[PDB]
Amino acid sequence: PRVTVYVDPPAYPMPRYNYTERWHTTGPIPSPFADGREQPVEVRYATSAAACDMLALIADPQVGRTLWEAVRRHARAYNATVIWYKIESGCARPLYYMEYTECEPRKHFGYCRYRTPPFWDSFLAGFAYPTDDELGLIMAAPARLVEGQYRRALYIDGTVAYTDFMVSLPAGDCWFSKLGAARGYTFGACFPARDYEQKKVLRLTYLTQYYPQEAHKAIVDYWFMRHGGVVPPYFEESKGYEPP
Amino acid sequence: DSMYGFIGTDVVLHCSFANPLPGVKITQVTWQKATNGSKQNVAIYNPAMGVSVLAPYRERVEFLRPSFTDGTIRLSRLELEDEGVYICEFATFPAGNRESQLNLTVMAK
Ligand SMILES: *[C@@H]1O[C@H](CO)[C@@H](O)[C@H](O)[C@H]1NC(C)=O
Numbered sequence: 172p173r174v175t176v177y178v179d180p181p182a183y184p185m186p187r188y189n190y191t192e193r194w195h196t197t198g199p200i201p202s203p204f205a206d207g208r209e210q211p212v213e214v215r216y217a218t219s220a221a222a223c224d225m226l227a228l229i230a231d232p233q234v235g236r237t238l239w240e241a242v243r244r245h246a247r248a249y250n251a252t253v254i255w256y257k258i259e260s261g262c263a264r265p266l267y268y269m270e271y272t273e274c275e276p277r278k279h280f281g282y283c284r285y286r287t288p289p290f291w292d293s294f295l296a297g298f299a300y301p302t303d304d305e306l307g308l309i310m311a312a313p314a315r316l317v318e319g320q321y322r323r324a325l326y327i328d329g330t331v332a333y334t335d336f337m338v339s340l341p342a343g344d345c346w347f348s349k350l351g352a353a354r355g356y357t358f359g360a361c362f363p364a365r366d367y368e369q370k371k372v373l374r375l376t377y378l379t380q381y382y383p384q385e386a387h388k389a390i391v392d393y394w395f396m397r398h399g400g401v402v403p404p405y406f407e408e409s410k411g412y413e414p415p
Numbered sequence: 416d417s418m419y420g421f422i423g424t425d426v427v428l429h430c431s432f433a434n435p436l437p438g439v440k441i442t443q444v445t446w447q448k449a450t451n452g453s454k455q456n457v458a459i460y461n462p463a464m465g466v467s468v469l470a471p472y473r474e475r476v477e478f479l480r481p482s483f484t485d486g487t488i489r490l491s492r493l494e495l496e497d498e499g500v501y502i503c504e505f506a507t508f509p510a511g512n513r514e515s516q517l518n519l520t521v522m523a524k
Pocket residue numbers: 248249250272273
């Protein structure tokens with residue numbers, strides 16, 4: 172603690188591959204709540220040993236098998252959607268929405284002719300970004316108020332799979348953690364299940380179209396390391412059991 | 416900053432980026448209205464991809480001189496419910512977003 176340091180500015184990275192980006196689209200974000208009859212959604216645990224660490228929410232969803240199954244059905248293309256939510260008592264805040272259309276099942280996930288820009292909760296996007304495979308999240312020195320329950324919803328070729336991550340931050344705020352603007356404003360609003368069901372949670376109305384993953388990663392890493400953060404070269408999978 | 420306007424009137428919400436830092440790339444401008452507080456987008460200007468106005472504002476909001484550094488809008492035919500905090504946000508790279516606020520108060524006549 173407690174000083175900024177100099178870091179080479181990152182170049183704006185080019186897109187990894189050739190696609191068309193669909194701007195200013197909207198649509199109702201679906202409810203993250205499943206019928207109580209169904210088995211519990213899988214739970215993983217994410218925590219930091221130190222307040223200025225990066226923290227990953229990673230759970231391999233075996234998306235290659237889903238795509239191998241489309242190839243054996245001789246499917247030409249598949250669609251996918253990736254959504255994240257913060258789950259609170261009776262309500263959920265939408266955090267992230269990314270839509271992939273006309274994708275090649277014989278390639279790795281996300282080789283798609285069209286993409287939206289990723290839709291974000293502005294506040295989360297200030298210190299967090301998708302993993303390289305775009306199926307997990309990395310958080311850079313999150314504030315303690317980030318603690319809670321994070322639900323990933325994967326819509327992939329019609330399948331839908333949920334994963335919950337319990338984020339715990341016992342080491343407290345990092346001295347440079349982002350705490351929000353005034354007063355006090357951090358996450359966008361928590362909506363009841365009914366609001367999702369009634370198609371009120373329009374993504375263009377409540378989230379921000381933002382930079383693709385590699386450019387998003389470059390912004391947050393730049394900010395993180397200017398405050399002395401070190402980016403680990405890898406993250407391990409989030410674990411299925413509670414921390415000590 | 417605070418503004419006042421009577422119902423039925425038109426009003427001009429100012430938003431400009433100065434002085435753009437050297438080496439800072441600007442990507443889009445966005446107006447948001449804050450409730451209690453739970454922001455909703457009002458209008459988006461992306462120089463590369465164009466403008467988008469969100470319901471309920473879709474005929475009542477227009478960018479006057481939209482550009483990388485100007486997001487000034489005219490909010491037309493004011494209603495009581497238009498009262499509140501309005502936030503103008505520039506998305507920039509590599510340095511992140513830059514904002515400004517203004518309290519708007521709508522009056523009875
Ligand atoms: C993907 O979505 C488009 C509309 O967005 C639809 O017309 C098309 O049938 C979908 N393709 C697949 C393989 O689901």
